[PDB]
Amino acid sequence: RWQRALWFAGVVFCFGISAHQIAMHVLDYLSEPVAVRIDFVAQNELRIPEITVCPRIFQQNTIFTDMVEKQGIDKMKFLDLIDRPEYDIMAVWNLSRIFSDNVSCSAHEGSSIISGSYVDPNMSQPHLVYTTSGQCINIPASRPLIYRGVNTFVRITDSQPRNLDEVRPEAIQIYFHEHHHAHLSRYLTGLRGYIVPIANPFAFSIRFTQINYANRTDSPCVDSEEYAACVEDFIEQRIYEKAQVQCRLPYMRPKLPLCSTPTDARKIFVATDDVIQNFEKESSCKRKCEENLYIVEFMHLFERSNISIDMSVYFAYNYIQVATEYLTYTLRGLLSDIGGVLGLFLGICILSVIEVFEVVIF
């Protein structure tokens, strides 16, 4: 009657409400949330980002646009050089070289009260690499620099004749990146790189900022190497099935031969443009787990020296800011919260339920 019906109403209310927090909690766990922890890691071992230094983009490299303009053709159709036998595609892209074999890079990873900074030229030296911007110089930047103050930098230097033998380069295309399945150097140096002058001995300063992501079903991060493989493979696949040529330009993996004819080379170069401009959206592999960010500011520093190209890249801050996305609702939290909901919207305990089941079997 009255009392039993009201007891039934109370029990149904408690169960239904206790079925509205457990159901919501399980739905929350299924669509797992993610919070962000930000830390400031002070490390006395800074990992130099790989530096790709290119000319301007062929048509703006007023080294290449001069030699090409000497052969009866002009920048715009610079790729027609391949028509005549004595010019091949590799020669054309060597024609944009603005560096000179003696390109060095020292590591000034400290200072002293005598003899100023501590010079260390033993770090991996630059090597030439073919990029869509021409023939660039890539700094391996293999080992990490010991952070011994704000005067901790890498000085890249080139000493080609600075006299009136030819028009001299005005700009260079810097690009800071990471290693291995080279597409950052070979494709994206023209786009993501800073165009800076070389009239004066410039200086960069770089702060590091890592953005770690949480690997989860609805947004799976893939470590850097496989992301680079995804991006480069997609880029070349779209480049080949966009001109049907089945050939490569000097900035592409040695998969198929170098088609030495302007028409074919023109198709590949234009397809390269189209793909690299918008490879971000039509790719499939999502962001990396680790997302390094080099906040590159400009500093005046030291003073000048008479030399062709001087580039001091400073790392005056050792506090690499890390921002990590993480799973904030692991299963243990779900179990504990379900226990809490049952225990504070009902009378059920775990030992209570086990004893009830024991009584079930008597």
Least CB distance from residue 135 to its own copies, whole Å?
A: 14
User: Rounded distance, CA 171 to CA 62, Å?
Assistant: 9
Residues paired with residue 298 on neighbouring β-strands, in sequence order: 204
Q: How far is the CB of 18 from its own copies (least distance, A)?
A: 8
For residues 318 to 357, the per-residue mask of contacts with its own copies, x marking binding by CB under 8 A and - elsewhere, is: -x---x------------x--xx-xxxxxx-xxxx-xx-x
Q: In angstroms, give the least distance from the CB of 251 to its own copies.
A: 10
Judged by CB under 8 A, the residue of 30, 35, 167, 307 near its own copies is 35
Give whichever of 31 and 305 is closer to its own copies, judged by the CB atom: 305
Q: Which of 39, 31, 29, 37 is nearest to 325 (CA)?
A: 37
CB 274 within 8 A of CB 242: yes
Beta bridge partners of 158: 103, 309
CB nearer its own copies, residue 88 or residue 291 = 291
User: Is position 12 an interface residue for its own copies (rule: CB under 8 A)?
Assistant: no
Taking CB under 8 A as the binding criterion, the range among 37-45, 83-91, 95-103, 155-163 that sits at the site for its own copies is 37-45
Element containing residue 88 per DSSP (H, E): none
* CA 51 to mean position of chain CA atoms: 12
Per-residue interface string for the shown chain with its own copies, residues 203-242, x marking contact by CB under 8 A: --x-x-x-x-------------------------------
Which of 47, 143, 148, 242 contacts its own copies by CB under 8 A? 148
DSSP assignment letter at 156: E
Q: Which two tokens stand for residue 170?
A: 């005005």
Q: How far is the CB of 92 from its own copies (least distance, A)?
A: 14
Which of 102, 166, 194, 256 binds its own copies (CB under 8 A)? It is 194
Q: Which of residues 103-132 bind its own copies (CB under 8 A)?
A: 110-116, 132
The alpha carbon of 104 is separated from its chain's Cα centroid by a whole number of angstroms, namely 24
**Angle CA(184)–CA(188)–CA(193) in degrees, nearest 5?**
100
CA proximity to 230, closest of 180, 194, 274, 157: 180
At position 59, the amino acid (one-letter code) is Q
Chosen residue from 151, 224, 261, 292 binding its own copies by CB under 8 A: 151
* Cβ closest to its own copies, residue 234 vs residue 294: 294
Residues 245-284 vs its own copies: string with x where CB under 8 A?
------------------------xx-xx--xx--x----
Cβ 226 to its own copies, closest distance in Å? Answer: 19
**Residue in 64, 130, 202, 279 binding its own copies, rule: CB under 8 A:** 202
Interface map 284-323 toward its own copies (x if CB under 8 A)? ---x---x-x-xxxxxxxxx------------xx-x---x
> What is the rounded CA–CA span in Å between residue 335 and residue 341?
10
Piece of the chain touching its own copies by CB under 8 A; list 52-60, 82-90, 101-109, 159-167: 52-60
Name which position in 23, 30, 39, 255 contacts its own copies (CB under 8 A).
Answer: 39
Among 90, 196, 230, 285, binds its own copies (CB under 8 A): 196
Least separation, in Å, of the C-beta of 362 and its own copies?
A: 5
Place of tokens 């990992």: 47
Per CB under 8 A, does 150 bind its own copies? yes
**Cα 19 to chain centroid, rounded:** 46
Considering only residues 83 to 102 of the shown chain, the ones binding its own copies according to CB under 8 A are none
Candidate residues 133, 138, 160, 185; the one interacting with its own copies per rule CB under 8 A: 133
Residue 74 token pair: 């002009």
132 CB-near residues (< 8 Å, 6+ apart): 57, 186, 187, 189, 190, 249, 251, 269, 272, 276
Distance CA 120, CA 107 (A): 5
Is there a contact between 240 and 61 (Cβ–Cβ < 8 Å)? Answer: no
What is the spatial distance between Cα 325 and Cα 168, in angstroms, rounded to a whole number? Answer: 48
Round to whole Å and give the CA distance between 27 and 56.
Answer: 54
